[PDB]
Amino acid sequence: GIVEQCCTSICSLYQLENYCN
Amino acid sequence: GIVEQCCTSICSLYQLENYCN
Amino acid sequence: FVNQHLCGSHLVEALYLVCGERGFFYTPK
Amino acid sequence: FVNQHLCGSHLVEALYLVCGERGFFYTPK
Numbered sequence: 001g002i003v004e005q006c007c008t009s010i011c012s013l014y015q016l017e018n019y020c021n
Numbered sequence: 022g023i024v025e026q027c028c029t030s031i032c033s034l035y036q037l038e039n040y041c042n
Numbered sequence: 043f044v045n046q047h048l049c050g051s052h053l054v055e056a057l058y059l060v061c062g063e064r065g066f067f068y069t070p071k
Numbered sequence: 072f073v074n075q076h077l078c079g080s081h082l083v084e085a086l087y088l089v090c091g092e093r094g095f096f097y098t099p100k
Contacts, residue, residue: 001100006085007078013089016073019097020090021069022071027056028049034060037044040068041061042098051087058083058097068087069094 005015026036048056057066077085086095 003099011077013073016089020093020095024070032048034044037060041064041066054087065098067096
């Protein structure tokens with residue numbers, strides 16, 4: 001999930017936008 | 022929604038917790 | 043910290059603090 | 072601001088900035 005993709009590894013805009021409504 | 026209850030009017034714990042997963 | 047007007051990043055912060063490991067949804071109209 | 076490790080309030084902040092009026096969901100495992 002988001003913690004794995006953005007906290008434990010380097011985040012990206014691409015991944016962040018998957019969590020926008 | 023949340024903006025109406027917490028931004029435009031005074032927020033509460035009660036209302037915030039309605040938006041927890 | 044919750045019993046006030048909370049907008050924008052301030053509201054997101056309150057959700058984050060209150061909801062803890064649950065997480066939350068932030069959905070403006 | 073997005074191309075780094077983002078945890079906790081830092082991650083919430085990035086979601087808030089990126090997603091704008093859409094809002095977002097923050098759901099840890």
